[model samples]
Target: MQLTPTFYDNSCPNVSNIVRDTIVNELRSDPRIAASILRLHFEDCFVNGCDASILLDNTTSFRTEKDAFGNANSARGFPVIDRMKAAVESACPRTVSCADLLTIAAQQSVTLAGGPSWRVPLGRRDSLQAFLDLANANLPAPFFTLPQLKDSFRNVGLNRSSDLVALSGGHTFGKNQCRFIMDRLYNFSNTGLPDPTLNTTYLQTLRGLCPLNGNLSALVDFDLRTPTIFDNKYYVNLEEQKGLIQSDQELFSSPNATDTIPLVRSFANSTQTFFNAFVEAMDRMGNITPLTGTQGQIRLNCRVVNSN
Candidate 1:
C-alpha cells in the first residue's frame, strides 16, 4: 500500500512537529546528531526496506543489523531515535509507529541541517525481526566503484541513475572515521599509492589527519567546505576530487562515471535542482516495500519488538 504524508493527520496531527522538537532539543548537546540521524534513516531503508528493523536489539528470534558491515561503529544515533520515540509515544500512545517516526526524523534532520524539507510520507509499521545478512550484503560499500555503486542501488529496487547520485548527496554533511577512507589514502587498489582521483592537496590533509597506524577513530568531514550544512558541496567536492569516500568520488571521476557525471555537475550548479531531486529520491527510497495495513506491529519501544 502507498504511504502518504497525511496518513497521521487524524490519528496524530502533530507527529512531525513532535519529531522536530525532539531533534531540536537533542541538537543542543549533539550538533552532529542531525546528520547521524539522517544517515540512520538511510541505513535502515537500504536494508530490508524502511521497517525500523535497524533499531531492533538482538533477541532469541534473530540477530540485529546494528553490527553489520555498514553499521558497526559507524551508523549511530540510535539513542537519539529512542528519545524521539519516547517523546512521541508520551503524546500519541501507540498511534504512531517507530518506522514512521524514523521517516519524520530524517526529514527533520535535513531541514534542521539547512537542507530542503519535504512532506514526508508516514504509516509504516515496525518489523518484528532484523536482518543482519541483508544489512551486510545490501549496503553499498565505501570502496565501491561507480558500476558497483549503481548495482547496489539497482539491487534494492531504485533503478534510476538520478536516484543513485541524488541519494549520495546525503554526505554533504557529517563526518567519516579515518578507517572508511584508509584505502583511498594509502595502498588504493593495493597499488601502494593514494587513489589518483583524489586532489593532491586534499590527500595531504587526509594523510596528515589519518597517518598510517594512527588513530582509526579520528573523524573527517565529508564536505570540508561546509561540513555542518547540507548543501551541494558534496557534488562540488566530487568535482574537485575532494569526495572523502571512494564510492562518492567515483560518481564524477571513475571511468564509467559518464551517467553520473552530469547529475553531479548539475547538482553542484544549482541547489534547487539538487533539493528537488533529493526529495524525489528520498521519497522513493522511504517507500521501499514498507509494511502497511497491519503487515507489522507498532512497537511500544523502538529498540525491541512487541512481545508476541
Candidate 2:
C-alpha cells in the first residue's frame, strides 16, 4: 500500500478537519448524507479500486459508471462530496486527491453516524477514465445469495467472509428504497412467493410498506432498531430475521451460510468485535488498487478530469 495516515501531514495538516466539518454541515440538511457518501465510497472502491472513477460524468470519449445498473439512480451524494472537495480545495487547492477525499469522507460519515473512528490512509489519485462495465460486474446486488456475495468480494480479493460480514454492517444505519427488494418481497427466483427464509411477520410488514401498487419512492431503513445509528444492530437484525435486504439477511439465513453465520453471531454478540473487524476491513478496502505518489493527477473538479 502506497498510503499512510500521515501522508498529508506536511502539505495539508488540517485535511481531516476540512472533511469532518463539511460532512457535519451537510448532515444537517440531509440527515442521511453520511450513508449516501458512504455508499458512493463503497461503489468507487469496489469498481476501479477507489480512484474516484465513479465521480466522473459522461464525456465524448467514454461513458461514466454513474448510469450503470446498480448506480443509475442509486449512486448519489456527489453533491456532498463535491461540497467537501470545494471546501478542501479552497483550503489547499488541488493538493488533496478526490480519491483520498472520498476515503476521508467515508471515515468521518460513519463516525458521525455513531460508528467507530479510524485514521484514514491518504495519497490516492484520480482516474482519467471510468469503467462502467466493471461497476455492474463488481458491485454486490440486493438479491445476492450467500455464495454470490462471497464470490463478489472474493473476485476483488477483498477480506473474504469475515470482512464481508463486517462491512455489511454498514447496513446498520442507511435507508434503501423499495425497488431493491421487490423480488425478495414478492417473488424469490420466480417462485411467485416471498423468500422462504424471510420471517413471516417481517415479510408482512415489508409487504405493507411495499405493496404491489404502492408508492415506488417509499424508503426503508436497513436496520429498524437504530435506523440512523451505525452499530452492530445490523447483525442482530439478521439473527432476528429483520434484515431489510436479502443480501444482508442471507449472510446469516442462507442455507449455505457456513462461513458467515458465526461471524454474524459474533458481531451480534459484541459491538466492539464488529468495530475492530470493520476498521480492518475499511483499511484493507481503502488500499485496493490505489494510484499513489506520481501515478494519476489530482482533479480540479471531482465530476470531470482536469482539462489538459
Candidate 3:
C-alpha cells in the first residue's frame, strides 16, 4: 500500500488546507490542543495502525478503546476531530477518510507547535471495528524501562533503536497527570523513598505539585524549561535528571539504556539532527498496516462504523 502526498489532490483538492485551517483556528483558542491531537494519532496508530480506532464511540453492540486503561480519561481532542470531519465533508463529502485526516492533523499540529514538518501520505481508510483490549496490551506504560519500551515499539514492527529515543521526544509538549508518577515521588518500589535517579531539587518541586494521595488530575509539564515549545530541551532535561516521567528519564538514567544514551546526547546537542530523525521516524510510523484500495470504507461520520 504505497501512499503519496497528492493522493487527494484530484478528488478533493482542498482537503489538506481544510484540515490545516481547522487546526489553526482551534490552536489559536488553545495552544495545548496541538499536543492533544498529536497524541490521539500516536495512541490510535500504535494500537491498530492509524485507523482512527480511538475516535469510535461505544455503541450498543460493544465498548470502544476509549475505556481502556491507557486512554480511559487520558486521551482528548475528540471534539476538534469532529469539527475537522464536518468541515471536510462540507466540501468533499465522504471522499476523504478519517484515518488520513488524523495523520494530516497530527503533522499540522507538530508544525504549528514549533516542531518539524513532514508531508503526510494520504488515501488511508477507517477501520470498521475498534480494538479495546489491544489498546491496553500494546501501548507503553509510564513505568516502562528501556527494554520494555523497545519491545513495545518492536511489537508494532518499529525496529530501530534510535526510533525509541526520537519518538519519545513527542513528550516535549504535553502534560502528565500526577497519578502517573506518584509512586516515583513518594514510595518507589515500596522503599518509602523517591527514585534515586530523580534529581533531588527537581524531586522537591514535583512533591509540591503532587502530594501523597492528592489530586490525581493535577497537571505537570513534561518539558519544564519550554513547556509549549517542541525542541531538544526534553533531552536536556533528561541529561539534568529533571525528566518529569520515569519512562522519559529512563533513556539516560536506566542501566539497560546504555545503547540509547548516545542517541539521546546527540539529539540534545543538535536540534537539526533530532528534527531529521523525528521526521523520518514519523513517516515510517504512518505507513504501518494501512487499509487501502477498497479494504476499508471512508466513514461519513468518524465516530461510528458505516451501516450496510
Candidate 4:
C-alpha cells in the first residue's frame, strides 16, 4: 500500500534517516557489516529503483545470487536492512517501511563509508510495484560500453549531457567485484576490453583472488582511499584510471560525456555542493510520473502488493 510522504519524516523520512543514523552508528561500533551494506545498496539501486533486487533468489531467470568472482561467497540482498526494519517495526509499530529505510540506508551508507552527506529530501513515497524487467534493463553490466551507459541513463529519464553524471557520486562506497570484471581483467581479448592500467603487479592481485577461471566471489573495490566516504574521490580516481569497472572509467574518456568528467572531480572537494547536487539528482531520479487514482497500494508484504 502507498504510504503518506511523511512516513519518512518523523515516522520515516522519504528515505530512512533513522536507518541511516543507525547504520552509521552501528558501523562506528563495527565496520565489517557497514561496508557490505554499502555494496548491497549499490547492487539494489543499480538493478532497480533500489528495490532489493540483490535479495531476490535466482530460482528462475533473475540476477544470480551466486558470486561469480570465485570467492566462494554469496551476496545477500537487504538482509541486514530487512532485519533492521523488523526491529524498527517492533519498536515503532508500522512506523517505518523498508523502501524508505533502504534509500536512506544507501545514501547514509556512502557518508558513513567516508563519502559526503547530501540533504535527502523527505516525503518520497515507497513504490508498490517491483518492476523486474525495468531493474534488469537499467542496471549496468560489466560488459556494457560507454555508449550503453549513456543511453541507459537517458532512457531512464536522466539527462546525460547535463546533471546525470551526478549519480556516480554514489560510487564513493563499495568495491568492484573482480568476478564481474573478470572478462575485462583477464579474458579481455575475447570477452571484454582490457584496461591498459593493469601492470604485472596489479594482475597478480587479481590472480591471488581469482584462479584461472572467473569467479563471482572474487571482489575488488572501486573506492579505495575512502572506501566508505561519499566524497569526489571516485571522480579523482577515475581521472587516474583507478576506476574498477570499465563503465566507471569510460565516464571521463567516453565520447558521450568526456567533458563532464572534470565537473565530477570538482564535487569531490566540496561535500556541501556534492550533497546539493546529489539531492537534486535524487529528486529527478525519484518517481516523477504524476500519481493517478490508486496507482499503487500500501503493500502488506513488501515483496508485492495486497489486493484489497
* Best candidate according to lDDT: 1
Indicate the residue-level lDDT of 187 in model 3. 88
- lDDT by residue for model 2 (49-155), tens: 99999999999998999999888977688888888888889889989999999999999999999999889888899998999988888988887778888889887
| TM-scores for every candidate against the unseen true structure | 0.98, 0.97, 0.98, 0.73
lDDT of each: 0.91, 0.88, 0.90, 0.56
Error of 1 at 224 (Å): 0.7
Worst lDDT run of 10 residues, candidate 1, spans: 79-88
How does model 2 score by TM-score? 0.97
Give lDDT tens digits, candidate 4, residues 123-206: 333344444555556566656677777677776567544345677666666555656667656677484545664444555666
How would you encode candidate 3's per-residue C-alpha lDDT over 1-308 as one tens digit per residue? Answer: 78889899899998878888998898788878999988999998898798888889998776799999979988889989999999999999889999999999999888888999778888889998898889989999988888999999998879997789998999999899999999899889899988998999999999999988789899899999999898889999999999888899899999998788999999999999999989888888888788899888999899999996
**Candidate 3: deviation at residue 184, Å?**
0.9
Model 3 regions lying over 4 Å from their true place: none
Off by over 4 Å in 4: 1-17, 25-77, 124-129, 161-164, 189-193, 197-204, 211-216, 268-273, 288-293
By TM-score: ranked, best first: 1, 3, 2, 4
What RMSD does each model have against the real structure? 0.9, 1.1, 1.0, 4.8
- Count: clashes, candidate 4: 34
Worst 10 residues of 4 by lDDT: 63-72
State residue 105's C-alpha deviation in candidate 4, in Å. Answer: 1.8
**Candidate 1 displacement at residue 204 in angstroms:** 0.8
Q: Which ten residues in a row have the lowest lDDT in candidate 3?
A: 116-125
Clashing pairs in 3: 45-50
What RMSD does model 2 have? 1.1
Clashes of each: 0, 0, 1, 34
lDDT of 2: 0.88
